[PDB]
Design a protein around this ligand. Structure first.
Ligand SMILES: CN(C)c1ccc(C(=O)NCCCCCCC(=O)NO)cc1
Ligand SMILES: CN(C)c1ccc(C(=O)NCCCCCCC(=O)NO)cc1
Ligand SMILES: [K+]
Ligand SMILES: [K+]
Ligand SMILES: [K+]
Ligand SMILES: [K+]
Ligand SMILES: [Mg+2]
Ligand SMILES: [Mg+2]
Ligand SMILES: [Mg+2]
Ligand SMILES: [Zn+2]
Ligand SMILES: [Zn+2]
Lengths: 346, 345
């Protein structure tokens, strides 16, 4: 039936790190260029709709969400790391432990730790440019929807939803979904909802809008007691200040299938309807998949068609930002199934 | 002069193969030959009697460290292996700025909650070695409490970066803090802990930060530039009843003994004003001009001068071994402090 436009960057390997700290070893990263290659190949093979490259928006709309100091650090981090004589990729070794001061130091190792929440997200040559391109992909999709499209697929790589205003991690650097939501707001959309269906909690998006009532943030995810990001995402985090009751976390345990997960989806859609937003950003991960190598939900490829159909029933202008999903064999089928389901495929 | 040394062969149970350094997993800097080389110099110089530690149990450890943290260190490795991880136990995630200081269930979450860095791998035997190292410090404290002027606790792993419930910087139990608290528990009214290791003793500072009965002083490289980065600045003077009972003295790269010893003199005057009943010296020789991870310029002969100055404080004194990573000179440097204390120049 319907068609949906996809925005992508041709340089899938602009970010091309070779190490990820995992179980005490430095392994090949889970978040690989072939993730974007495979999704794009399936977008073309299914003729989802027009494919386009991103427009350059510059750092202005990125800085509506992220701090100036953080954006500067990501641009210079690799250069400074190399200049200090380190021989691996840029990985934090030390951080602000409990009892220490949240105080920005001068040394590159100190800044790396100050600005991170994990050691599994290496930085190297090209990472800065890749983060910038991924944010432009998100902003191009947002522009397409603002200028008339019902929906658009921002094929973001690297993902974004773990990044705070000034913290990177969980393979994320710029919070593409938050940048898209803030762009809707800046363009006069009074209220925006960001719905996070990636397997992991969107802690970055929660933190960015936590004290605000004009952006509703909702995430379904695996229990942070058991999985990343561990220290946010619990159901008692409902917002702060004016943002009280405008954040909603819905947690699930291991082996949760679509029959159960979709009940949380319905609760999220009901909260969205009450909020009555003017635009919707969906932070889409397919790491809820039953074969995902780092996650523990049990969705099947066919369930993603049902997910897309239910999201379309919200009846809102919708930007999809690509987040996680690490079984590369199925990542294209799974992600494009959501878009096809949104466009009417059953 | 003579000084007794306490040493445990169980330190060898701490023998990890990997350290995250500059984005790579390398052979660790804090390796067993450090302790063995110091011990051989103790024997070579006939410094004094060499004793093995008594077992004091977890009680004196738990006077400073939380029960949950002590329990975590005992089970960490087994939980890591049972969860299917194939490397040594290394934190990957932690409580980032903006997140909740909330203890999770999963082993990765607990590892991150209890840590300040990823350069301190845990493997089999780390628990046993950390326990033996605390007993080494407590045996040295007992020797001094029962009549010795001073004693050398040849601790490995070191301790001064360990908070009540945080490990890191190669440290698990804060041996110096445990010895200090033992003095206090035995009726010594006031105790000073003087940290001459190159790095800030952030764990010792944190443990006593709100207390005026234990004065904590550290000389160290500028944390703006070096580990631990997020504590050790001169404006950290204590909290609550502890305000004015913590003193950090910071130095820049290439600082020689002629400058470092001015900071030492300031520390000694602060101790003299405090008038403690006992002194614990957290001793690192990573202030040495050839230390591979530090940037001060002390010579081996300067350690004789350091030990002489410490003896002039006239206090019952426990030395706990902390850092120092030029293994060629680590024995000469550390034993020079003890020999300078006992009167050698
Ligand atoms: C069994 N195994 C090999 C693993 C299990 C869990 C992780 C992990 O959570 N890593 C931290 C990154 C989680 C978030 C990734 C980015 C994402 O999709 N966010 O939604 C890794 C490996
Ligand atoms: C040039 N190079 C090879 C290095 C430079 C610095 C470190 C480091 O600070 N690592 C963090 C550990 C610092 C504390 C070590 C334990 C200690 O001595 N505490 O006093 C490592 C390597
Ligand atoms: K989620
Ligand atoms: K909110
Ligand atoms: K020190
Ligand atoms: K104090
Ligand atoms: Mg450094
Ligand atoms: Mg398969
Ligand atoms: Mg885990
Ligand atoms: Zn995810
Ligand atoms: Zn040191």
């Amino acid at each position: 039936l319907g068609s949906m436009k996809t925005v992508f960057s041709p340089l899938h390997s602009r970010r091309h790190v070779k190490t990820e700290l995992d179980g005490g070893l430095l392994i090949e990263p889970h978040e690989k260029p072939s993730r974007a290659e495979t999704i794009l190949a399936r977008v073309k093979d299914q003729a989802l709709g027009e494919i386009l490259e991103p427009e350059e928006f510059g750092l202005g709309p990125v800085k509506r969400v992220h701090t100036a100091d953080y954006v500067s650090f990501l641009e210079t981090c690799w250069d400074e790391w190399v200049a200090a004589g380190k021989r691996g990729e840029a990985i934090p070794t030390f951080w602000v432990g409990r009892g220490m001061r949240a105080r920005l130091p001068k040394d590159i190792d100190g800044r790396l730790g100050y600005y991170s929440l994990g050691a599994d997200t290496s930085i190297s040559d090209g990472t800065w440019e890749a983060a910038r391109a991924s944010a432009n992909v998100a902003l191009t999709a947002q522009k397409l929807v603002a200028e008339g499209e019902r929906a658009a697929f921002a094929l973001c790589r690297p993902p974004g939803h773990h990044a705070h205003a000034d913290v990177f991690g969980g393979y994320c650097f710029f919070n593409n979904a938050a940048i898209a939501a803030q762009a809707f707001r800046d363009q006069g959309y009074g209220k925006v909802a960001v719905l996070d269906v990636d397997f992991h909690h969107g802690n970055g998006t929660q933190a960015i809008f936590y004290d605000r009532s004009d952006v509703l943030t909702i995430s379904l995810h695996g229990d942070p007691d058991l999985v990343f990001p561990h220290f946010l995402g619990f159901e008692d985090e409902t917002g702060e200040g004016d943002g009280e009751a405008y954040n909603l976390n819905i947690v699930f345990p291991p082996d949760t299938p679509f029959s159960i997960w979709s009940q949380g989806l319905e609760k999220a859609c009901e909260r969205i309807r009450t909020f009555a937003p003017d635009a919707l950003v969906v932070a889409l991960g397919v790491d809820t998949f039953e074969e995902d190598p780092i996650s523990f939900f049990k969705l099947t490829s066919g369930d993603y068609l049902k997910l897309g159909k239910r999201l379309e029933q919200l009846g809102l202008p919708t930007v999809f930002t690509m987040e996680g999903g690490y079984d590369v064999d199925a990542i294209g089928v799974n992600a494009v199934n959501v878009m096809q389901g949104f466009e009417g495929k059953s």
